[PDB]
Amino acid sequence: SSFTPLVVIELAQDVKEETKEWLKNRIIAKKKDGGAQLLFRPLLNKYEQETLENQNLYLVGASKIRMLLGAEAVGLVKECNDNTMRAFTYRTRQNFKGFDDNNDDFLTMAECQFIIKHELENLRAKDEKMIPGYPQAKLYPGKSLLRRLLTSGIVIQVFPLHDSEALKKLEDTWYTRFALKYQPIDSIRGYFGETIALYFGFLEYFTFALIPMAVIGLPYYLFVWEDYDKYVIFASFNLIWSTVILELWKRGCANMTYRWGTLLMKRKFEEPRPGFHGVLGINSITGKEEPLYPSYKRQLRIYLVSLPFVCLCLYFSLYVMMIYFDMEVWALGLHENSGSEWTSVLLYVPSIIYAIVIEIMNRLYRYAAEFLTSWENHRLESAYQNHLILKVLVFNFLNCFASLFYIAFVLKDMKLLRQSLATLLITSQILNQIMESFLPYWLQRKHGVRVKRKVQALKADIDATLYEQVILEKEMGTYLGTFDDYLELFLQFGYVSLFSCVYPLAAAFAVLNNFTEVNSDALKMCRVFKRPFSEPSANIGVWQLAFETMSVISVVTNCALIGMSPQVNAVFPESKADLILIVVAVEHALLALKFILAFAIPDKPRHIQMKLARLEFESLEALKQQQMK
Amino acid sequence: SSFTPLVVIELAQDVKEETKEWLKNRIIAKKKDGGAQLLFRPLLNKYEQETLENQNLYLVGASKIRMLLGAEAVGLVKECNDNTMRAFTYRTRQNFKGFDDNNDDFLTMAECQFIIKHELENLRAKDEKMIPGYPQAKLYPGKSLLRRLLTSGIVIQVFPLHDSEALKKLEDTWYTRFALKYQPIDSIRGYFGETIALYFGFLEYFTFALIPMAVIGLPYYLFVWEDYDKYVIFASFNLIWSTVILELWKRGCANMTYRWGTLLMKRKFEEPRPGFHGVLGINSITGKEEPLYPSYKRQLRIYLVSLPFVCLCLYFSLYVMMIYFDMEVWALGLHENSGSEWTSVLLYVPSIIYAIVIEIMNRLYRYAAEFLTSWENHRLESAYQNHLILKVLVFNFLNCFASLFYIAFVLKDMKLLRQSLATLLITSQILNQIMESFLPYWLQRKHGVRVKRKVQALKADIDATLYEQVILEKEMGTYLGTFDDYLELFLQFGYVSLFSCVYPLAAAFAVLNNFTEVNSDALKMCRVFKRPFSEPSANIGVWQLAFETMSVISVVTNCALIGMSPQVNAVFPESKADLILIVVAVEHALLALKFILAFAIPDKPRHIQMKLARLEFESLEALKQQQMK
Ligand SMILES: CCCCCCCCCCCO[C@@H]1O[C@H](CO)[C@@H](O[C@H]2O[C@H](CO)[C@@H](O)[C@H](O)[C@H]2O)[C@H](O)[C@H]1O
Ligand SMILES: CCCCCCCCCCCO[C@@H]1O[C@H](CO)[C@@H](O[C@H]2O[C@H](CO)[C@@H](O)[C@H](O)[C@H]2O)[C@H](O)[C@H]1O
Ligand SMILES: CCCCCCCCCCCO[C@@H]1O[C@H](CO)[C@@H](O[C@H]2O[C@H](CO)[C@@H](O)[C@H](O)[C@H]2O)[C@H](O)[C@H]1O
Ligand SMILES: CCCCCCCCCCCO[C@@H]1O[C@H](CO)[C@@H](O[C@H]2O[C@H](CO)[C@@H](O)[C@H](O)[C@H]2O)[C@H](O)[C@H]1O
Ligand SMILES: CCCCCCCCCCCO[C@@H]1O[C@H](CO)[C@@H](O[C@H]2O[C@H](CO)[C@@H](O)[C@H](O)[C@H]2O)[C@H](O)[C@H]1O
Ligand SMILES: CCCCCCCCCCCO[C@@H]1O[C@H](CO)[C@@H](O[C@H]2O[C@H](CO)[C@@H](O)[C@H](O)[C@H]2O)[C@H](O)[C@H]1O
Ligand SMILES: [Ca+2]
Ligand SMILES: [Ca+2]
Ligand SMILES: [Ca+2]
Ligand SMILES: [Ca+2]
Ligand SMILES: [Ca+2]
Ligand SMILES: [Ca+2]
């Protein structure tokens, strides 16, 4: 009753006492009795008439030997004394670096909350056919208790607790408000898990990978050096540099994910996602009882409902693009009509209105695609994430770059392309930084001041540092994965690299954004959202394919912008049939050299590959010594 | 002394008696005494004055429990009773299908010879600093005995024995001399290992994958249907069909290699190859003692000696191409000079001479590249094979298709392109089938008749069925891997798919070749060569990338041949700048649709993926039950 709280479970209001005692008896009971062996506590041992509306919050922690056995059960990969990353076991626990028998600093709070979430997830029902007290909670043997408690509306949320004394010491070394500074990815990892640290490492890498593009492209646009090289040197430098940074990110990510251990953590078998419903049956792979869904019904629900909706949304995005171009022609006629002083500022208004309409339509399509992909009854979470990423990537690519493609390849007017690209990039980045972190931080500050003034007017002997913290973090927003935060970088790379020939200055407009975003997203993790659960990840995932596809599409787009400028057309003034052949030959040579650069450089580095080969050879020698005895 | 001989070891002539008794004491001795526990025998217990020149051949076999323990040591994957492919262990040996305690039909002769070769390979020296009787044989602890006996010229060759009563029952169902017949890949596997069976399965697949190309392209060339579709339907059909067959081969190969078990055999750690010499030192990965070579010396020996030699050989191939074109112009002038009757046959002579010079220069470059890649001191065998495949593929692509590229894209004369492509393909295939299998089979028949007539004039009580067989198979040729046999199919796919627009009939010229090659290569494995050692292989390897690169290059080549025909140029007679743009757009759409087809179709099939997921889940449940106890 004096332990450290790690995970808060918030029950619903209308929850009977029998379900509460049954959940408390299924949490505290030992691992041999079908429980989880976690220390359980109410938020307050006593209650008064004021705090009766907060009577459902419960705290879950455990003891040290329980956390070490849970780390054995999860499969954490820690550093041994001989500079080797091996899986953690309780029988071989003395081989690991920084471990004592009396050390509470071995497993960090992020790993402890991950272990408690994994032990609450692996809390299955064996004998019970229903939840005691609730009729409709259909429980089959082999079904997780927490998933059915979350879907049926009994457990509202399970969230870990922020540590207000280790978050401040992270924030002191995170906000690079003064100048350039290397981001502390290891402390970000030790506080937030590995997925958030991999995102912040990718953002720190992508910031320091557009700096050669911005530095080369800043006098290339101001001093106009397009006369001397005629768009051949700079375009080749941009495309080769994009391939080089997208391969060296894979090398640095292999180095980082070996340094944390998640390169060696095995692939855990995935449970059906919360919201996959079928008929009860025998799972073919595992042999246990699971919901089953026929695959032809899922393929019909995709290829007859989702794909026509995606095509309708792409057509509606093109229709809004045509409305914007009619508005642009109307504003140009109004500039031709009225005057000179107020009719130059009037040309920047419809692109700003179009950027706001783009950032509204993207969120509306995001809600529609989340509903339409949660409707197709996807089994795993990886397949649901892949389908959602495909839908959102296709519509966001079309809706963001359709007007720029229509300016560049139909109107062929580079001045309007420069103006529209700069206005779209700057307005979308500013509205992204306002709606993403700053306005939710202001609303969170207002809510925190209100919760503080409510807690200070109390009539009980409450230790305020814990109850006040749990009440404040109950009403915070949850983190919905690192999907929008990679999508913003994908659209930044799209605005930079697709039209870097006709407008390299936009690359600088990414770097001056990222110098804020490294701060801003950090604030979004620190004072805006709840603490996310730690998730091990070995790579960025499917985003590597998306960034490489962007870098491949930008080859064709950059060469088509080379073959339309007045600089290259002065070389071939009369014969426009050899210009297309030379531009297509340069484009195919750049694609071949890009694929040769992506295939030649190895993905893992040299010493990481040697360490994985040593880790394989030690297991092979263990197998040989088991065979020999 | 009455066992079945499986592996023949041929010693050299000048070998002292002490080395023979030391090798015999290191073979027969048990596994705990540092030996191999194999039954060893001389070829003949007695010798007369006639057979004294064949006194170095020795036979190696073993007993049944020894072969089962060696199958446990190797890691064979056999079928359990519950339709599951698990690794073979002697303690769990009763779970497997078709196994008795008194059954000599469980492990086939190919698997037994592979196990005996693996036990002779894993015969290491511990105490001895040199081979007893030979001073220069430098032996370090951790060095294989058979490798040092092979490199120092004491053991001449180690080869398995043909089974003359199971080869006939394979040959009865292999030679499809009558008509079309499905090739027995499982019996080919059970006799020849998995690599030869994967090659013959790929040849059987590639024969039945050019039949739609030949059947569609036979009236497309005779009835000239190029007027109606204008090269758009047929080219798209060819490129989509090449992508579809190169993905369905990966699906069928996953199915076959799961059906044999080599999809689940673990990657064995590779010893340094026979001919990698450096300085003696500590291996960083394994920790034992190995030869070490500095990587910068190897990179210098590649990028300063090998690459200039490859560039010089490509320049010499272009110079021989220019000599052939001067000869072609001279023969055309001679046809203009002399007459009509004998001056039409004279146009086919210089292309035949060029095909013979191509097939001579390819073998000369193959010898030069084998010497130049065995000179760079490559450590593993996979790296040596990859470098040799790169050199031979680049030179053979250039030397075979340089004249056709010069006709198609410089001269732009489709009649000479049809004549030269048909003559090069037919003459190269005929000379390939003559020099590959038929002439070595005739020489082997002559040598076998001579060896038979020598053995029948004997003066001893020799059981002739074994000694005669070992003497005949001593002087046969060895199989140098499945590299030339995939290279022939690569060049066939190059001659078919690069110029399938202007000459689809050549696709038929592949199928009428393969209907012989399925027979001919089979004869090359049956009555020409020694029995190859069984090698497990899960795929064709790097040849998938080579066939996909050929299918990608053929998109650009087919579209460049579309944009030069008189059929497509009649659509755009005046504006030749929109024709190039439309052809390049069709080419990029075909490349995008080809990559979408290669990414959309999964590599492994559905049920193979379910079986691998079940095999992973059973091991995860075993780990969980080990953790719970
Ligand atoms: C151009 C983009 C610029 C982006 C800048 C982003 C960063 C701005 C804010 C930096 C300081 O961040 C600030 O840190 C302090 C702690 O030191 C936080 O304070 C909070 O925690 C402390 C410590 O428990 C409490 O005493 C305090 O009452 C509470 O409000 C505050 O809520 C946060 O706002
Ligand atoms: C992946 C395929 C890549 C292809 C890349 C090239 C594609 C387009 C090539 C042809 C367009 O190239 C060129 O474009 C311009 C418009 O910008 C056309 O017209 C313009 O030419 C110049 C441009 O300063 C002006 O002097 C002229 O008055 C105007 O008509 C021109 O007739 C065409 O020749
Ligand atoms: C892997 C294979 C790689 C290469 C494949 C592609 C090779 C394409 C080679 C094309 C060479 O063919 C080349 O075509 C251009 C038109 O485009 C010709 O150009 C000529 O005709 C065009 C059309 O009437 C005129 O506009 C132009 O002023 C004139 O020079 C040129 O004389 C010829 O030499
Ligand atoms: C278009 C291309 C056509 C390719 C045709 C390829 C096949 C042609 C030969 C087919 C028959 O193959 C033939 O089989 C017999 C066995 O039955 C072989 O005979 C050999 O083994 C048998 C059995 O131990 C011995 O009795 C015999 O003395 C020995 O020569 C012979 O060497 C081989 O040549
Ligand atoms: C990846 C890039 C792919 C590009 C594909 C297209 C490349 C070449 C395009 C231009 C060549 O297209 C065309 O070729 C022929 C030669 O075959 C040229 O010349 C010929 O045209 C026709 C061909 O029956 C004849 O009537 C004429 O007398 C002759 O000069 C023509 O001027 C050019 O217009
Ligand atoms: C991801 C991006 C995908 C698309 C990228 C490539 C887009 C290229 C679009 C090019 C359209 O530009 C198009 O160029 C051709 C020349 O090539 C022009 O053609 C015109 O000029 C040329 C040159 O003087 C004349 O030969 C021809 O008879 C005339 O019609 C045409 O009027 C214009 O409309
Ligand atoms: Ca932002
Ligand atoms: Ca962000
Ligand atoms: Ca790579
Ligand atoms: Ca042949
Ligand atoms: Ca062959
Ligand atoms: Ca695939």
Numbering used by the authors:
A (entry chain B), B (entry chain A): 13 to 641
Recite the paper's sentences.
TMEM16K is a widely distributed, but relatively unstudied member of the TMEM16 family. Here we show that TMEM16K is an ER-resident lipid scramblase with non-specific ion channel activity and a dependence on calcium ions and short chain lipids for optimum activity. We present structures of TMEM16K solved by both X-ray crystallography and cryo-electron microscopy, revealing a classic scramblase fold, with extensive conformational changes propagated from the cytoplasmic to the ER face of the membrane, which lead to opening or closing of the lipid transporting groove. The TM domain of TMEM16K is C-terminal to the cytoplasmic domain and has ten TM α helices with TM3 to TM7 forming the lipid scramblase ‘groove’ and TM6 to TM8 forming the binding site for two Ca2+ ions, seen in other TMEM16s.
To understand whether TMEM16K can adopt alternative conformations and how changes in Ca2+ concentration affect the structure, we obtained three electron cryomicroscopy (cryo-EM) structures for TMEM16K in the presence of (i) 2 mM (‘high’) Ca2+, (ii) 430 nM (‘low’) Ca2+ and (iii) in the absence of Ca2+ (in 10 mM ethylene glycol-bis(β-aminoethyl ether)-N,N,N′,N′-tetraacetic acid (EGTA), ‘Ca2+-free’). These data sets had resolutions of 3.5, 4.2 and 5.1 Å respectively. The low and high Ca2+ structures are remarkably similar (mainchain r.m.s.d. of 0.42 Å); therefore below we describe the higher resolution 2 mM Ca2+ structure, unless otherwise stated. In the groove region, this conformation resembles the Ca2+-bound state of the mTMEM16A channel, and the recently published TMEM16F30, afTMEM1637 and nhTMEM1629 closed groove structures. The change from an open to a closed scramblase groove state is associated with extensive movements of the cytoplasmic domain and several transmembrane helices, leading to the ER end of the TM3−TM4 α-helical hairpin blocking the ER end of the groove. The closed scramblase groove has three distinct sections: a hydrophilic vestibule on the ER side of the membrane, a narrow neck and a cytoplasmic vestibule. The hydrophobic neck is lined with residues from TM4−7 (Tyr366, Ala367, Leu416, Ser415, Thr435, Leu436 and Tyr507), which together form a physical barrier to lipid movement. There is clear density for one complete lipid molecule in the 3.5 Å closed groove structure, lying adjacent to TM3, TM5 and TM9, in the cytoplasmic leaflet, a critical site for movement of the TM3−5 unit. The first unit rotates and moves up so that TM3−TM4 blocks the groove, while the second unit moves down, providing space for the first unit to rotate. These changes in TMEM16K conformation are not caused by changes in Ca2+ binding, as all three Ca2+-binding sites are occupied in both the 2 mM and 430 nM Ca2+ structures.
